[PDB]
Design a protein that fits this description.
The complex is a heterotrimer of chains A (about 15), B (about 80) and C (about 375). Chain A has about 15 residues and is mostly helical. Chain A has 1 helix and no strands. The longest helix of chain A is centred in the middle third of the chain and has 4 residues, at about 5-10. With about 80 residues, chain B is an all-alpha fold. Chain B has one domain (about 1-85). The longest helix of chain B has 13 residues, at about 50-65. Chain B is globular and about 35 Å long. In chain C, the strands form 5 sheets. In chain C, strands 1, 2, 6, 9, 12, 13, 14, 18, 21 and 23 form a 10-stranded mixed β-sheet that branches. The longest helix of chain C is centred in the N-terminal third of the chain and has 7 residues, at about 105-110. Chain C has helices at about 45-50, 105-110, 240-245, 255, 310-315, and strands at about 5-10, 20-25, 35, 50-55, 60, 70-75, 90-95, 95-100, 115-125, 130-135, 145, 150-155, 180-185, 205, 215-220, 245-250, 260-265, 270-280, 295-300, 300-310, 320-325, 330-340, 355-360. The relative contact order of chain C is 0.16. By secondary structure, chain C is mainly beta. Helix content of chain C is about 5%, strand content about 35%. Classes of the chains: A mainly alpha (about 15), B mainly alpha (about 80), C mainly beta (about 375). The complex binds a molecule of 2 linked components (NAG-NAG) and 2-acetamido-2-deoxy-beta-D-glucopyranose (2 copies). One 2-acetamido-2-deoxy-beta-D-glucopyranose (NAG) binds near residues 88 and 372 of chain C. Chain B: This is GPI-anchored protein LLG2.
Amino acid sequence: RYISYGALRRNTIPC
Amino acid sequence: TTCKEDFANKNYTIITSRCKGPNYPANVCCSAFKDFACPFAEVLNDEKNDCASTMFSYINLYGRYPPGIFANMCKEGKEGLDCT
Amino acid sequence: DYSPTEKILLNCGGDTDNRIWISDVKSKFLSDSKTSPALTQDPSVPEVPYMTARVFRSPFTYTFPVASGRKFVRLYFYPNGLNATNSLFSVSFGPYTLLKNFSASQTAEALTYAFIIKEFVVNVEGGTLNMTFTPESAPSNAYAFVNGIEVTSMPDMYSSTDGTLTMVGSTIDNSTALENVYRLNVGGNDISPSADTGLYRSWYDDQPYIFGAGLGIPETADPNMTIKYPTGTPTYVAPVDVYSTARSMGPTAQINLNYNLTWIFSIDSGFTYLVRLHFCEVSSNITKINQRVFTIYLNNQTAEPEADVIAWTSSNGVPFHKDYVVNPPEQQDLWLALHPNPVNKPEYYDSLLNGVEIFKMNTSDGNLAGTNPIP
Ligand SMILES: *[C@@H]1O[C@H](CO)[C@@H](O[C@@H]2O[C@H](CO)[C@@H](O)[C@H](O)[C@H]2NC(C)=O)[C@H](O)[C@H]1NC(C)=O
Ligand SMILES: *[C@@H]1O[C@H](CO)[C@@H](O)[C@H](O)[C@H]1NC(C)=O
Ligand SMILES: *[C@@H]1O[C@H](CO)[C@@H](O)[C@H](O)[C@H]1NC(C)=O
């Protein structure tokens, strides 16, 4: 199993 | 879809006492994040849930972390972070 | 903009982008075929010119009257009474074989696209051209087909003859053929061929090519900022929408030291690649030298040790670009990455990119065709 990059993209920087 | 798991009462020391400082060393910080969130890889990885955003919210609140450090400096391979 | 003298939009067997097409039925271009409309319709797919196709049972050759010059040549394919999987063929021009052993279906759905557009840049001497479609004799099933064809005049935009301007990351372009494999508006939106600067090139958002979750941030120019192309520069080099939008690493310097802003592009092996990178400093904070300096790595190796966009341009909001050649280590992933260079102590630790263009360079004189994408 992996932590998917989709989950990581929930940490994406906002404006 | 409110998260199945509760992230408010989890123990974030795993991260807070390792990912630190003015420098956020990629290896240390990504090790700590994996240690904390790999046991919930199943729920986070599911797009339908409201959990991943809720988790990062708590991680960044208890650590006072900069905005996108995990998304930006944690990468391993095409599959994602191994967590095994 | 650029107005091309020749704009031959040819639809086979006869849009959403304000461009008029012409059937190939009574075309002087036609020099037999079995025209058929498409068997199945996908709403994502536009009828023109995808719905109508012409099928070559046996070799076919197309001719177009064109002045001496370089042309964009773009094939339009949509995989579809014959069976779609069994279409294997080759396409040739002059001494250049554009395509060989090509499957539209195996190509198209390995990439999760309904339809494909293939782009080439070719030089033509004389008033005519060779467009030949040949169903591969190797298996008998094999047939050829084309939904549509575009031939467009073009300046000699992407050549670097000038002496010693280009070397590979470890080179000469003149009357070589190029196939465009990526054309990205980094940190910006898609750009349809109408909205291009008169050359009818499609620009795609770069985000699907970011490697992990590492997106940094997108930047756009301020409204009181004006993109000024340098005096004596063609203004059709890339739309202003390309240079007004960019991608960078984020507001935190020490974070930007610990990661690369990276993109990855699957490429055919056995070729050498032209990579045109597009720059324009859109940030209000960056107005002087040694504020934003960064290293560019192509295929895990250094193409640019220290890229200061101001040193390249001397001002805010002025476009610039640079060509590189990547020779991959012999179907393959091409890496692009940027990192801040802190040597010389810049004000910010950051990186920037506005657009990307990658072309496959024809080897020797000969093939531009690669393997079919295993899905
Ligand atoms: C550049 O670096 C990467 C590794 O950071 C190279 O290697 C592969 O990386 C992927 C992650 O996408 C792994 O899943 C593969 O197993 C790795 N395989 C190998 C053989 O390394 C990448 O290939 C490198 N590219 C070049 C051309 O140097
Ligand atoms: C978190 O877990 C660690 C175990 O490594 C423990 O020592 C620590 O006291 C815990 N913190 C809290 C606030 O419960
Ligand atoms: C020829 O095309 C077939 C698919 O039809 C592919 O499996 C094979 O690898 C190709 N060989 C060459 C030399 O292109």
